[PDB]
Design a protein around this ligand. Structure first.
Ligand SMILES: [Ca+2]
Ligand SMILES: [Ca+2]
Ligand SMILES: [Ca+2]
Ligand SMILES: [Zn+2]
Lengths: 102, 151
């Protein structure tokens, strides 16, 4: 199971509430020679921070193509990006989305 | 003479893509496209670029945008000692902006002050109008959106 190289592409991010943001991505398994994917890592940080160590991480199963980030702060902008992974390692990051809770 | 904009106000108070403001969308500029060459990176030390992308995309903009942004950098520093202009988005290839966003052709910036003081943003927006941006929009409590006409 070669480590993934190419990451997912986040198609959209949209607030669902004052504490939750939905993201949906596309990941084409052929992009990494159909290496098995254990899951995705979804990273989010308040947009007011430019410290790349300040991202929090959610772990999602490898079959999902969307996720709802929760426990966020109201009326707050987040930077959101993601990787895919397997036992070999992690991909490069996706595009970086900016999205505010309600 | 400087009157802050209110939250959600835009100036001039007409649609962004009208003639009197920033004018029409001319098409997305992608990194590999022939049109990518008309963007150049702004490396002004007076400006902080968020660059959460870690690509330098935020620095890329048209000449008209760079000129207006550099003027605004000055007026921010003059207004508030020790505060600088910060750009969260310049040219964009991530794709989270409106359809046909001027960000996609390097004609728009989203900005804050360096101290992220939300109550500076109305005045920051007025400074951007005075700096000559063709449309300025207090779009979010979190940032101001400013754009320019095509070259
Ligand atoms: Ca960097
Ligand atoms: Ca950015
Ligand atoms: Ca961007
Ligand atoms: Zn904008």
């Amino acid at each position: 199971g070669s480590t993934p190289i190419t990451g997912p592409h986040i198609a959209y991010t949209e607030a669902v509430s004052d504490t939750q943001i939905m993201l949906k991505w596309t990941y084409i398994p052929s992009s990494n020679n159909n290496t098995p994917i254990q899951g995705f890592y979804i990273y989010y940080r308040p947009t007011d921070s430019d410290n790349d160590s300040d991202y929090k991480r959610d772990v999602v199963e490898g079959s999902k193509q969307w996720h709802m980030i929760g426990h966020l702060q109201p009326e707050t902008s987040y930077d959101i990006k993601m990787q895919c992974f397997n036992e070999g390692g992690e991909s490069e990051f996706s595009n970086v989305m900016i999205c505010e809770t309600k | 003479k400087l009157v802050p904009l209110a939250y959600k106000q835009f100036s001039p108070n007409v649609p962004e893509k009208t003639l009197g403001a920033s004018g029409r969308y001319e098409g997305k500029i992608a990194r590999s496209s022939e049109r990518f060459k008309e963007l150049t990176p702004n490396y002004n030390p007076d400006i902080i670029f968020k660059d959460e992308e870690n690509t330098g995309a935020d620095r890329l903009m048209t000449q008209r945008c760079k000129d207006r942004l550099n003027s605004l950098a000055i007026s921010v520093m003059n207004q508030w000692p020790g505060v600088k202009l910060r750009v969260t988005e310049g040219w964009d290839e991530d794709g989270h902006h409106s359809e046909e966003s001027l960000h996609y052709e390097g004609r728009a910036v989203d900005i804050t002050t360096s101290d992220r003081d939300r109550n500076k943003y109305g005045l920051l927006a007025r400074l951007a109008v005075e700096a000559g941006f063709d449309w300025v929009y207090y779009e979010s409590k979190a940032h101001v959106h400013c754009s320019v006409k095509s070259e």
